[PDB]
Amino acid sequence: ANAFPIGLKDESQSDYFYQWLEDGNIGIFGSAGYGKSTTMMTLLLSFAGAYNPAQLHYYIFDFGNSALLPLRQLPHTADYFRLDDEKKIEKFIKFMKEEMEQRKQRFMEKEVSTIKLYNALSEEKLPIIIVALDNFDVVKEEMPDFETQLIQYARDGQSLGIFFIMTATRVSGIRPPLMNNLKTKIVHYFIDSSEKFSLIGRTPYDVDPIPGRALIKKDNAALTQIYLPADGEDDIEVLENVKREMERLKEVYQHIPKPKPIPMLPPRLSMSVFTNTYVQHRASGFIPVGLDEQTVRPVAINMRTDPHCLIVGQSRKGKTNVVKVILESLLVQEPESIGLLDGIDRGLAGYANRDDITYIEAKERLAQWLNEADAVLQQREREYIQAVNENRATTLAWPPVVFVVDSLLRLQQETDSIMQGRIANMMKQYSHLGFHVFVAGNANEFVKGFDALTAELKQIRQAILVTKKSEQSLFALPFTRNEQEIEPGFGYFVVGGKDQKIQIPKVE
Ligand SMILES: CNc1ccccc1C(=O)O[C@@H]1[C@H](O)[C@@H](n2cnc3c(N)ncnc32)O[C@H]1COP(=O)(O)OP(=O)(O)OP(=O)(O)O
Protein backbone atom coordinates (compact mmCIF):
# COMPACT_ATOMS: atom_id res chain seq x y z
CA ALA A 1 0.00 0.00 0.00
CA ASN A 2 2.62 2.52 1.15
CA ALA A 3 5.94 0.64 1.22
CA PHE A 4 6.58 -0.56 -2.35
CA PRO A 5 9.31 -3.23 -2.63
CA ILE A 6 11.47 -2.36 -5.67
CA GLY A 7 14.54 -4.59 -5.22
CA LEU A 8 16.49 -7.10 -3.12
CA LYS A 9 19.33 -5.51 -1.13
CA ASP A 10 22.70 -7.30 -0.99
CA GLU A 11 23.99 -8.19 2.49
CA SER A 12 18.27 -14.35 4.63
CA GLN A 13 17.81 -10.87 3.13
CA SER A 14 15.10 -8.19 3.13
CA ASP A 15 13.50 -6.12 0.35
CA TYR A 16 14.35 -2.48 -0.37
CA PHE A 17 11.14 -0.50 0.21
CA TYR A 18 10.13 2.80 -1.40
CA GLN A 19 7.85 4.76 0.95
CA TRP A 20 4.94 6.54 -0.76
CA LEU A 21 5.31 10.36 -0.75
CA GLU A 22 8.01 10.34 1.97
CA ASP A 23 10.80 9.13 -0.36
CA GLY A 24 9.97 11.88 -2.90
CA ASN A 25 11.16 12.00 -6.50
CA ILE A 26 13.13 9.12 -8.05
CA GLY A 27 16.30 9.54 -10.14
CA ILE A 28 17.35 6.56 -12.25
CA PHE A 29 20.99 6.70 -13.42
CA GLY A 30 23.40 4.44 -15.34
CA SER A 31 25.06 3.57 -18.65
CA ALA A 32 23.24 2.09 -21.66
CA GLY A 33 21.97 -1.48 -21.30
CA TYR A 34 22.04 -1.63 -17.48
CA GLY A 35 18.33 -1.49 -16.57
CA LYS A 36 17.17 2.14 -16.49
CA SER A 37 13.92 1.58 -18.41
CA THR A 38 13.23 -1.69 -16.55
CA THR A 39 13.48 0.18 -13.23
CA MET A 40 11.09 2.78 -14.68
CA MET A 41 8.67 0.03 -15.77
CA THR A 42 8.91 -1.79 -12.41
CA LEU A 43 8.11 1.40 -10.46
CA LEU A 44 5.11 2.49 -12.55
CA LEU A 45 3.56 -1.01 -12.53
CA SER A 46 4.09 -1.39 -8.76
CA PHE A 47 2.24 1.85 -7.96
CA ALA A 48 -0.48 1.00 -10.50
CA GLY A 49 -1.25 -2.25 -8.65
CA ALA A 50 -1.96 -0.43 -5.37
CA TYR A 51 -3.70 2.82 -6.40
CA ASN A 52 -6.60 3.48 -8.79
CA PRO A 53 -6.53 5.33 -12.14
CA ALA A 54 -8.62 8.03 -10.42
CA GLN A 55 -6.05 8.21 -7.58
CA LEU A 56 -2.87 7.96 -9.69
CA HIS A 57 -2.27 9.65 -13.07
CA TYR A 58 0.73 8.98 -15.34
CA TYR A 59 2.23 11.13 -18.11
CA ILE A 60 4.94 9.05 -19.79
CA PHE A 61 7.55 10.91 -21.86
CA ASP A 62 9.35 8.12 -23.72
CA PHE A 63 12.24 9.74 -25.61
CA GLY A 64 14.46 6.63 -25.37
CA ASN A 65 13.62 3.82 -27.79
CA SER A 66 9.98 2.81 -27.21
CA ALA A 67 10.87 0.99 -23.96
CA LEU A 68 7.75 2.35 -22.23
CA LEU A 69 5.43 1.66 -25.20
CA PRO A 70 3.65 -1.20 -23.37
CA LEU A 71 2.73 1.16 -20.50
CA ARG A 72 0.53 3.11 -22.96
CA GLN A 73 -2.05 0.32 -22.46
CA LEU A 74 -2.37 1.09 -18.72
CA PRO A 75 -5.58 2.76 -17.46
CA HIS A 76 -3.43 4.99 -15.21
CA THR A 77 -1.69 6.64 -18.19
CA ALA A 78 -3.36 9.89 -19.26
CA ASP A 79 -1.17 10.47 -22.32
CA TYR A 80 2.00 9.08 -23.93
CA PHE A 81 4.59 11.42 -25.47
CA ARG A 82 7.34 10.94 -28.06
CA LEU A 83 10.03 13.23 -29.51
CA ASP A 84 7.89 13.88 -32.62
CA ASP A 85 4.89 14.99 -30.52
CA GLU A 86 6.10 18.57 -29.99
CA LYS A 87 2.68 20.28 -30.11
CA LYS A 88 1.39 17.80 -27.50
CA ILE A 89 4.35 18.54 -25.19
CA GLU A 90 3.77 22.29 -25.61
CA LYS A 91 0.13 21.84 -24.53
CA PHE A 92 1.25 19.71 -21.56
CA ILE A 93 3.43 22.60 -20.34
CA LYS A 94 0.33 24.83 -20.43
CA PHE A 95 -1.74 22.08 -18.76
CA MET A 96 0.69 21.65 -15.84
CA LYS A 97 1.04 25.42 -15.25
CA GLU A 98 -2.76 25.68 -14.95
CA GLU A 99 -3.00 22.45 -12.91
CA MET A 100 -0.30 23.56 -10.44
CA GLU A 101 -1.77 27.07 -10.22
CA GLN A 102 -5.24 25.61 -9.60
CA ARG A 103 -3.77 23.28 -6.95
CA LYS A 104 -2.07 26.18 -5.12
CA GLN A 105 -5.44 27.99 -4.97
CA ARG A 106 -7.27 24.96 -3.55
CA PHE A 107 -4.46 24.46 -1.01
CA MET A 108 -4.60 28.12 0.09
CA GLU A 109 -8.42 28.10 0.19
CA LYS A 110 -8.41 25.25 2.75
CA GLU A 111 -5.16 26.30 4.49
CA VAL A 112 -2.95 23.27 3.77
CA SER A 113 0.67 22.68 2.71
CA THR A 114 0.85 19.05 1.54
CA ILE A 115 -1.38 16.92 -0.73
CA LYS A 116 -1.77 14.34 2.07
CA LEU A 117 -3.63 16.93 4.16
CA TYR A 118 -5.82 18.25 1.32
CA ASN A 119 -7.07 14.78 0.31
CA ALA A 120 -7.72 13.86 3.96
CA LEU A 121 -9.92 16.89 4.71
CA SER A 122 -11.47 17.37 1.25
CA GLU A 123 -14.15 14.87 0.21
CA GLU A 124 -13.28 15.34 -3.47
CA LYS A 125 -9.76 13.89 -3.82
CA LEU A 126 -7.04 15.07 -6.22
CA PRO A 127 -5.04 12.52 -8.24
CA ILE A 128 -1.30 12.01 -7.72
CA ILE A 129 0.51 12.93 -10.94
CA ILE A 130 3.78 11.13 -11.72
CA VAL A 131 5.71 12.62 -14.66
CA ALA A 132 7.73 9.69 -16.04
CA LEU A 133 10.56 10.77 -18.36
CA ASP A 134 12.71 8.19 -20.17
CA ASN A 135 16.05 9.54 -21.48
CA PHE A 136 16.74 12.97 -19.94
CA ASP A 137 19.88 13.53 -22.06
CA VAL A 138 17.82 14.24 -25.20
CA VAL A 139 15.69 16.75 -23.25
CA LYS A 140 18.80 18.44 -21.81
CA GLU A 141 20.25 19.14 -25.28
CA GLU A 142 17.34 19.52 -27.72
CA MET A 143 14.53 20.80 -25.44
CA PRO A 144 15.68 23.61 -23.10
CA ASP A 145 12.12 25.01 -22.77
CA PHE A 146 10.82 21.67 -21.46
CA GLU A 147 13.92 21.31 -19.24
CA THR A 148 13.03 24.56 -17.44
CA GLN A 149 9.59 23.14 -16.62
CA LEU A 150 11.02 19.82 -15.37
CA ILE A 151 13.03 21.71 -12.72
CA GLN A 152 9.81 23.44 -11.60
CA TYR A 153 7.91 20.12 -11.42
CA ALA A 154 10.63 18.47 -9.30
CA ARG A 155 10.97 21.44 -6.93
CA ASP A 156 7.42 22.75 -6.46
CA GLY A 157 5.30 19.77 -7.59
CA GLN A 158 6.08 17.24 -4.83
CA SER A 159 4.23 19.31 -2.19
CA LEU A 160 1.21 19.67 -4.51
CA GLY A 161 1.10 15.90 -5.19
CA ILE A 162 3.02 15.97 -8.48
CA PHE A 163 6.05 13.65 -8.39
CA PHE A 164 8.74 13.22 -11.04
CA ILE A 165 10.71 10.21 -12.30
CA MET A 166 13.53 10.29 -14.88
CA THR A 167 16.32 8.19 -16.39
CA ALA A 168 19.65 9.76 -17.37
CA THR A 169 22.77 8.36 -19.06
CA ARG A 170 24.99 11.38 -18.28
CA VAL A 171 24.62 12.97 -14.83
CA SER A 172 27.53 15.37 -15.44
CA GLY A 173 25.57 18.32 -16.85
CA ILE A 174 22.35 18.05 -14.83
CA ARG A 175 21.67 21.18 -12.77
CA PRO A 176 22.04 20.97 -8.94
CA PRO A 177 18.46 22.23 -8.40
CA LEU A 178 17.10 19.30 -10.42
CA MET A 179 19.58 16.86 -8.86
CA ASN A 180 18.83 17.94 -5.27
CA ASN A 181 15.05 17.65 -5.71
CA LEU A 182 15.53 14.04 -6.84
CA LYS A 183 15.15 12.62 -3.32
CA THR A 184 15.63 8.94 -4.20
CA LYS A 185 18.52 8.00 -6.53
CA ILE A 186 18.77 4.58 -8.19
CA VAL A 187 22.36 4.38 -9.50
CA HIS A 188 23.10 1.55 -11.95
CA TYR A 189 26.59 0.75 -13.29
CA PHE A 190 28.64 3.42 -15.10
CA ILE A 191 31.52 2.98 -17.57
CA ASP A 192 33.27 6.31 -16.98
CA SER A 193 34.93 6.87 -13.59
CA SER A 194 34.20 10.63 -13.59
CA GLU A 195 30.46 9.92 -13.87
CA LYS A 196 30.53 7.79 -10.69
CA PHE A 197 32.41 10.44 -8.68
CA SER A 198 29.64 13.05 -9.05
CA LEU A 199 26.98 10.62 -7.76
CA ILE A 200 28.86 10.00 -4.48
CA GLY A 201 27.58 13.33 -3.14
CA ARG A 202 28.64 15.01 0.10
CA THR A 203 30.92 13.19 2.55
CA PRO A 204 32.79 13.97 5.81
CA TYR A 205 35.67 15.20 3.59
CA ASP A 206 33.48 18.14 2.48
CA VAL A 207 33.24 19.38 6.10
CA ASP A 208 35.63 22.29 6.72
CA PRO A 209 37.22 22.94 10.14
CA ILE A 210 34.54 25.36 11.39
CA PRO A 211 32.65 24.87 14.70
CA GLY A 212 29.04 24.20 13.62
CA ARG A 213 29.87 22.83 10.16
CA ALA A 214 28.81 19.18 9.80
CA LEU A 215 27.54 16.46 7.47
CA ILE A 216 24.15 14.97 8.40
CA LYS A 217 23.73 11.39 7.16
CA LYS A 218 20.02 10.50 7.22
CA ASP A 219 20.32 6.93 5.93
CA ASN A 220 23.05 4.71 4.46
CA ALA A 221 23.14 3.70 0.79
CA ALA A 222 22.39 0.08 -0.14
CA LEU A 223 23.51 -2.16 -3.01
CA THR A 224 20.27 -3.46 -4.52
CA GLN A 225 19.12 -5.78 -7.30
CA ILE A 226 16.01 -4.17 -8.79
CA TYR A 227 13.16 -6.62 -9.44
CA LEU A 228 11.83 -7.18 -12.96
CA PRO A 229 8.30 -5.86 -13.64
CA ALA A 230 7.10 -9.42 -14.36
CA ASP A 231 8.54 -12.93 -13.96
CA GLY A 232 10.43 -14.46 -16.91
CA GLU A 233 13.65 -16.11 -18.09
CA ASP A 234 14.24 -13.78 -21.07
CA ASP A 235 13.21 -10.33 -22.38
CA ILE A 236 10.26 -11.69 -24.41
CA GLU A 237 8.74 -13.73 -21.56
CA VAL A 238 8.95 -10.70 -19.24
CA LEU A 239 7.42 -8.39 -21.87
CA GLU A 240 4.61 -10.93 -22.43
CA ASN A 241 3.83 -11.20 -18.69
CA VAL A 242 4.06 -7.40 -18.45
CA LYS A 243 1.26 -7.22 -21.05
CA ARG A 244 -0.74 -9.83 -19.09
CA GLU A 245 -0.18 -7.80 -15.90
CA MET A 246 -1.80 -4.71 -17.48
CA GLU A 247 -4.74 -6.76 -18.79
CA ARG A 248 -5.53 -7.55 -15.14
CA LEU A 249 -5.30 -3.87 -14.15
CA LYS A 250 -7.71 -3.02 -16.99
CA GLU A 251 -10.14 -5.70 -15.75
CA VAL A 252 -9.80 -4.76 -12.06
CA TYR A 253 -10.19 -0.99 -12.57
CA GLN A 254 -13.14 -1.20 -14.99
CA HIS A 255 -15.71 1.04 -13.25
CA ILE A 256 -13.07 3.56 -12.10
CA PRO A 257 -13.08 6.67 -14.33
CA LYS A 258 -10.01 6.87 -16.58
CA PRO A 259 -7.81 9.99 -16.94
CA LYS A 260 -8.41 12.49 -19.75
CA PRO A 261 -5.83 12.69 -22.57
CA ILE A 262 -4.30 16.09 -23.36
CA PRO A 263 -6.88 18.04 -25.42
CA MET A 264 -5.66 18.82 -28.96
CA LEU A 265 -7.29 20.71 -31.84
CA PRO A 266 -7.38 18.74 -35.12
CA PRO A 267 -5.89 20.34 -38.27
CA ARG A 268 -9.13 19.73 -40.20
CA LEU A 269 -12.59 19.62 -38.59
CA SER A 270 -15.73 18.54 -40.45
CA MET A 271 -19.33 18.79 -39.20
CA SER A 272 -19.88 15.01 -39.39
CA VAL A 273 -16.86 14.30 -37.16
CA PHE A 274 -17.79 17.23 -34.88
CA THR A 275 -21.33 15.90 -34.33
CA ASN A 276 -20.35 12.24 -33.81
CA THR A 277 -17.14 12.16 -31.75
CA TYR A 278 -16.86 15.53 -29.99
CA VAL A 279 -20.50 16.56 -29.47
CA GLN A 280 -21.75 14.16 -26.78
CA HIS A 281 -24.26 16.43 -25.00
CA ARG A 282 -27.25 16.33 -27.40
CA ALA A 283 -29.43 18.47 -25.11
CA SER A 284 -32.68 20.18 -26.11
CA GLY A 285 -32.39 23.95 -26.63
CA PHE A 286 -28.62 23.81 -27.24
CA ILE A 287 -27.00 24.52 -30.62
CA PRO A 288 -23.34 23.38 -30.73
CA VAL A 289 -21.37 25.83 -32.91
CA GLY A 290 -17.76 24.63 -32.53
CA LEU A 291 -14.90 23.49 -30.30
CA ASP A 292 -13.20 25.83 -27.83
CA GLU A 293 -9.58 26.65 -28.69
CA GLN A 294 -8.06 26.00 -25.25
CA THR A 295 -10.20 23.29 -23.63
CA VAL A 296 -11.25 21.60 -26.91
CA ARG A 297 -14.89 21.00 -25.95
CA PRO A 298 -18.16 21.80 -27.76
CA VAL A 299 -19.36 25.38 -27.17
CA ALA A 300 -23.12 25.78 -27.68
CA ILE A 301 -25.78 28.49 -27.91
CA ASN A 302 -28.36 28.28 -25.12
CA MET A 303 -31.60 28.95 -27.04
CA ARG A 304 -33.71 29.44 -23.89
CA THR A 305 -31.60 32.24 -22.39
CA ASP A 306 -30.04 33.62 -25.59
CA PRO A 307 -32.53 33.01 -28.45
CA HIS A 308 -31.10 35.35 -31.12
CA CYS A 309 -27.59 35.42 -32.63
CA LEU A 310 -25.62 37.51 -35.16
CA ILE A 311 -23.07 36.17 -37.67
CA VAL A 312 -20.69 39.11 -38.13
CA GLY A 313 -17.74 39.28 -40.55
CA GLN A 314 -16.42 40.23 -43.99
CA SER A 315 -15.82 36.69 -45.29
CA ARG A 316 -18.73 35.45 -47.43
CA LYS A 317 -17.47 31.86 -47.12
CA GLY A 318 -17.02 32.21 -43.34
CA LYS A 319 -20.53 33.56 -42.69
CA THR A 320 -22.25 31.07 -45.01
CA ASN A 321 -20.41 28.18 -43.32
CA VAL A 322 -21.51 29.27 -39.83
CA VAL A 323 -25.13 29.43 -41.07
CA LYS A 324 -24.84 25.80 -42.26
CA VAL A 325 -23.34 24.75 -38.89
CA ILE A 326 -26.41 26.28 -37.20
CA LEU A 327 -28.82 24.80 -39.77
CA GLU A 328 -27.30 21.32 -39.35
CA SER A 329 -27.48 21.62 -35.55
CA LEU A 330 -31.07 22.94 -35.75
CA LEU A 331 -32.09 19.84 -37.76
CA VAL A 332 -30.97 17.62 -34.85
CA GLN A 333 -33.59 19.43 -32.75
CA GLU A 334 -37.34 19.11 -33.45
CA PRO A 335 -38.24 22.52 -34.94
CA GLU A 336 -41.70 23.72 -35.97
CA SER A 337 -40.46 25.71 -38.97
CA ILE A 338 -37.24 27.19 -40.39
CA GLY A 339 -37.49 30.24 -42.68
CA LEU A 340 -34.23 30.28 -44.64
CA LEU A 341 -33.66 33.58 -46.48
CA ASP A 342 -30.64 32.94 -48.72
CA GLY A 343 -28.42 35.66 -50.21
CA ILE A 344 -28.23 36.72 -53.87
CA ASP A 345 -25.77 33.87 -54.47
CA ARG A 346 -27.84 30.69 -54.05
CA GLY A 347 -25.35 28.85 -51.82
CA LEU A 348 -27.80 27.25 -49.38
CA ALA A 349 -30.06 25.78 -52.09
CA GLY A 350 -29.39 22.21 -50.88
CA TYR A 351 -31.27 22.84 -47.62
CA ALA A 352 -34.42 23.91 -49.51
CA ASN A 353 -35.65 20.39 -50.33
CA ARG A 354 -35.09 19.13 -46.75
CA ASP A 355 -37.98 18.76 -44.29
CA ASP A 356 -39.03 21.54 -41.88
CA ILE A 357 -37.25 24.18 -44.02
CA THR A 358 -39.07 26.84 -46.05
CA TYR A 359 -36.64 28.23 -48.65
CA ILE A 360 -37.32 31.95 -49.11
CA GLU A 361 -36.26 34.02 -52.14
CA ALA A 362 -38.95 36.56 -53.10
CA LYS A 363 -40.84 38.99 -50.86
CA GLU A 364 -44.24 37.30 -51.29
CA ARG A 365 -42.92 33.93 -50.03
CA LEU A 366 -41.41 35.58 -46.93
CA ALA A 367 -44.80 37.11 -46.04
CA GLN A 368 -46.41 33.65 -46.29
CA TRP A 369 -43.86 32.17 -43.87
CA LEU A 370 -44.32 35.04 -41.38
CA ASN A 371 -48.08 34.31 -41.39
CA GLU A 372 -47.47 30.62 -40.63
CA ALA A 373 -44.87 31.53 -37.98
CA ASP A 374 -47.00 34.24 -36.33
CA ALA A 375 -50.05 31.94 -36.25
CA VAL A 376 -48.09 29.42 -34.14
CA LEU A 377 -46.50 32.09 -31.91
CA GLN A 378 -49.88 33.77 -31.32
CA GLN A 379 -51.22 30.44 -29.99
CA ARG A 380 -48.20 30.11 -27.67
CA GLU A 381 -48.82 33.66 -26.41
CA ARG A 382 -52.38 32.70 -25.41
CA GLU A 383 -51.18 29.60 -23.53
CA TYR A 384 -48.53 31.71 -21.76
CA ILE A 385 -50.99 34.44 -20.68
CA GLN A 386 -53.69 31.92 -19.68
CA ALA A 387 -51.11 30.08 -17.54
CA VAL A 388 -50.16 33.23 -15.60
CA ASN A 389 -53.77 34.40 -15.15
CA GLU A 390 -54.84 30.97 -13.83
CA ASN A 391 -51.80 30.64 -11.51
CA ARG A 392 -50.13 27.79 -13.41
CA ALA A 393 -46.49 27.00 -14.16
CA THR A 394 -45.65 28.29 -17.65
CA THR A 395 -44.17 26.00 -20.32
CA LEU A 396 -40.38 25.74 -20.11
CA ALA A 397 -39.63 25.24 -23.82
CA TRP A 398 -41.32 25.00 -27.24
CA PRO A 399 -40.34 23.71 -30.70
CA PRO A 400 -38.12 26.50 -32.11
CA VAL A 401 -39.57 28.76 -34.82
CA VAL A 402 -36.28 29.89 -36.39
CA PHE A 403 -35.74 32.67 -38.95
CA VAL A 404 -32.31 32.19 -40.56
CA VAL A 405 -30.92 34.92 -42.83
CA ASP A 406 -27.75 34.40 -44.92
CA SER A 407 -27.56 38.09 -45.94
CA LEU A 408 -28.70 41.17 -44.00
CA LEU A 409 -28.37 43.28 -47.16
CA ARG A 410 -30.69 40.90 -49.04
CA LEU A 411 -33.26 41.10 -46.21
CA GLN A 412 -33.36 44.92 -46.38
CA GLN A 413 -33.79 44.86 -50.18
CA GLU A 414 -36.61 42.28 -50.03
CA THR A 415 -38.59 44.14 -47.31
CA ASP A 416 -40.22 47.53 -46.72
CA SER A 417 -40.89 49.73 -43.66
CA ILE A 418 -44.13 47.87 -42.83
CA MET A 419 -42.68 44.35 -43.19
CA GLN A 420 -39.42 45.36 -41.46
CA GLY A 421 -41.44 46.71 -38.51
CA ARG A 422 -43.50 43.51 -38.38
CA ILE A 423 -40.41 41.32 -37.94
CA ALA A 424 -39.04 43.75 -35.32
CA ASN A 425 -42.32 43.51 -33.37
CA MET A 426 -42.28 39.68 -33.53
CA MET A 427 -38.85 39.73 -31.84
CA LYS A 428 -40.16 42.04 -29.09
CA GLN A 429 -43.37 40.03 -28.63
CA TYR A 430 -42.45 36.36 -29.12
CA SER A 431 -38.79 36.14 -27.97
CA HIS A 432 -39.86 34.23 -24.83
CA LEU A 433 -42.13 31.84 -26.79
CA GLY A 434 -39.63 29.85 -28.88
CA PHE A 435 -38.94 32.42 -31.61
CA HIS A 436 -35.35 32.65 -32.89
CA VAL A 437 -33.45 34.82 -35.38
CA PHE A 438 -30.05 34.21 -37.00
CA VAL A 439 -28.83 37.08 -39.20
CA ALA A 440 -25.55 37.27 -41.14
CA GLY A 441 -23.77 40.30 -42.60
CA ASN A 442 -20.90 42.79 -42.38
CA ALA A 443 -20.26 44.70 -39.15
CA ASN A 444 -20.93 48.12 -40.71
CA GLU A 445 -24.34 46.99 -42.06
CA PHE A 446 -25.67 46.46 -38.52
CA VAL A 447 -24.26 49.82 -37.34
CA LYS A 448 -25.21 51.88 -40.41
CA GLY A 449 -28.77 50.50 -40.52
CA PHE A 450 -31.16 52.71 -38.53
CA ASP A 451 -34.37 51.15 -39.90
CA ALA A 452 -36.95 49.39 -37.69
CA LEU A 453 -35.66 45.85 -38.37
CA THR A 454 -31.91 46.57 -38.17
CA ALA A 455 -32.40 48.66 -35.00
CA GLU A 456 -33.74 45.51 -33.30
CA LEU A 457 -30.91 43.28 -34.61
CA LYS A 458 -28.10 45.53 -33.31
CA GLN A 459 -29.36 45.06 -29.71
CA ILE A 460 -28.80 41.26 -29.79
CA ARG A 461 -26.04 40.54 -27.25
CA GLN A 462 -25.05 37.09 -28.60
CA ALA A 463 -22.98 36.60 -31.76
CA ILE A 464 -20.49 34.48 -33.70
CA LEU A 465 -17.72 36.70 -35.06
CA VAL A 466 -15.82 35.45 -38.13
CA THR A 467 -13.68 38.60 -38.12
CA LYS A 468 -11.20 40.49 -35.92
CA LYS A 469 -12.47 42.06 -32.68
CA SER A 470 -10.74 45.33 -33.62
CA GLU A 471 -12.55 45.43 -37.00
CA GLN A 472 -16.08 45.93 -35.60
CA SER A 473 -17.96 48.54 -33.54
CA LEU A 474 -20.85 46.30 -32.45
CA PHE A 475 -19.49 44.45 -29.40
CA ALA A 476 -17.03 46.09 -26.98
CA LEU A 477 -14.47 43.28 -26.63
CA PRO A 478 -10.86 42.94 -25.39
CA PHE A 479 -8.16 43.06 -28.08
CA THR A 480 -4.53 44.03 -28.75
CA ARG A 481 -2.24 45.14 -31.61
CA ASN A 482 -0.84 41.67 -32.34
CA GLU A 483 -4.18 39.96 -33.04
CA GLN A 484 -4.38 36.61 -34.85
CA GLU A 485 -5.51 36.62 -38.49
CA ILE A 486 -8.91 35.12 -39.33
CA GLU A 487 -8.15 31.81 -41.07
CA PRO A 488 -10.90 29.53 -42.45
CA GLY A 489 -12.79 27.64 -39.72
CA PHE A 490 -11.95 30.04 -36.88
CA GLY A 491 -13.88 32.75 -35.03
CA TYR A 492 -15.06 34.19 -31.71
CA PHE A 493 -18.19 33.22 -29.76
CA VAL A 494 -19.59 36.34 -28.06
CA VAL A 495 -22.24 36.04 -25.33
CA GLY A 496 -23.17 38.17 -22.29
CA GLY A 497 -20.13 40.45 -22.61
CA LYS A 498 -17.54 37.66 -22.49
CA ASP A 499 -15.98 36.00 -25.55
CA GLN A 500 -13.80 33.04 -26.56
CA LYS A 501 -11.91 31.68 -29.58
CA ILE A 502 -13.51 28.67 -31.29
CA GLN A 503 -12.83 26.23 -34.13
CA ILE A 504 -15.85 26.34 -36.46
CA PRO A 505 -16.33 23.01 -38.29
CA LYS A 506 -16.61 22.96 -42.09
CA VAL A 507 -19.95 21.74 -43.48
CA GLU A 508 -19.29 19.70 -46.64
C1 LIG B 1 13.25 -2.50 -22.26
N1 LIG B 1 14.15 -3.62 -22.04
C2 LIG B 1 13.87 -4.71 -21.26
C3 LIG B 1 12.65 -4.86 -20.58
C4 LIG B 1 12.41 -5.99 -19.80
C5 LIG B 1 13.36 -7.00 -19.68
C6 LIG B 1 14.58 -6.91 -20.33
C7 LIG B 1 14.88 -5.80 -21.12
C8 LIG B 1 16.22 -5.73 -21.82
O1 LIG B 1 16.34 -5.11 -22.86
O2 LIG B 1 17.40 -6.40 -21.27
C9 LIG B 1 18.23 -5.71 -20.32
C10 LIG B 1 18.16 -6.43 -18.99
O3 LIG B 1 17.71 -7.78 -19.13
C11 LIG B 1 17.18 -5.58 -18.19
N2 LIG B 1 17.25 -5.76 -16.71
C12 LIG B 1 17.01 -4.79 -15.81
N3 LIG B 1 17.13 -5.26 -14.54
C13 LIG B 1 17.44 -6.56 -14.62
C14 LIG B 1 17.70 -7.66 -13.66
N4 LIG B 1 17.65 -7.44 -12.32
N5 LIG B 1 17.99 -8.88 -14.16
C15 LIG B 1 18.05 -9.12 -15.48
N6 LIG B 1 17.82 -8.17 -16.41
C16 LIG B 1 17.51 -6.89 -16.05
O4 LIG B 1 17.47 -4.25 -18.60
C17 LIG B 1 17.81 -4.27 -19.99
C18 LIG B 1 18.91 -3.25 -20.29
O5 LIG B 1 18.55 -1.97 -19.78
P1 LIG B 1 17.18 -1.24 -20.22
O6 LIG B 1 17.01 -1.41 -21.71
O7 LIG B 1 16.08 -1.70 -19.30
O8 LIG B 1 17.46 0.31 -19.90
P2 LIG B 1 18.74 1.10 -20.49
O9 LIG B 1 19.14 0.50 -21.82
O10 LIG B 1 19.76 1.22 -19.39
O11 LIG B 1 18.13 2.57 -20.76
P3 LIG B 1 17.14 2.88 -22.00
O12 LIG B 1 16.27 1.65 -22.14
O13 LIG B 1 16.40 4.11 -21.54
O14 LIG B 1 18.08 3.11 -23.16
Author numbering: 968 to 978, 983 to 1479
The authors write:
The membrane-bound protein EssC is an integral component of the bacterial Type VII secretion system (T7SS), which is a determinant of virulence in important Gram-positive pathogens. The protein is predicted to consist of an intracellular repeat of forkhead-associated (FHA) domains at the N-terminus, two transmembrane helices and three P-loop-containing ATPase-type domains, D1–D3, forming the C-terminal intracellular segment. We present crystal structures of the N-terminal FHA domains (EssC-N) and a C-terminal fragment EssC-C from Geobacillus thermodenitrificans, encompassing two of the ATPase-type modules, D2 and D3. The observation of protomer contacts in the crystal structure of EssC-C together with similarity to the DNA translocase FtsK, suggests a model for a hexameric EssC assembly.
A crystal of the EssC-C–mant-ATP complex gave improved data and hence this dataset was used to finalize the structure at 2.9 Å resolution. The asymmetric unit consists of two EssC-C polypeptides, labelled A and B, each resolved from Ala968 to the C-terminal Glu1479. The polypeptide is composed of two homologous P-loop ATPase-like modules or domains (D2 and D3), which are connected by a linker (Gln1225–Ser1241). The structure derived from crystals grown in the presence of mant-ATP displayed additional density for the mant moiety in one polypeptide. ATP was included in the other since there was no clear density for this mant moiety. The Walker A motif lysine, Lys1007, and the backbone amides of Gly1004, Gly1006, Lys1007 and Thr1009 donate hydrogen bonds to α- and β-phosphates. The adjacent residue in EssC-C D2 is Asn1106 rather than the canonical acidic residue that primes a water molecule for nucleophilic attack on the γ-phosphate. The mant group is accommodated in a hydrophobic pocket formed by Val1209 and Leu1210 on α9 and Ala1038 on α2. In D2 the corresponding polypeptide does not extend the core sheet but rather forms an extended structure which we term the ‘β9-segment’ (Ile1171–Tyr1198) that protrudes from the globular fold so that β9 (Gly1183–Lys1188) serves to extend the central β-sheet of a symmetry-related molecule D2 domain through association with β8 (Thr1155–His1159) and β10 (Thr1195–Ile1197). Despite the inclusion of excess mant-ATP in the crystallization conditions we only observe the ligand to bind the D2 domain and this is consistent with binding data that suggest a stoichiometry <1.
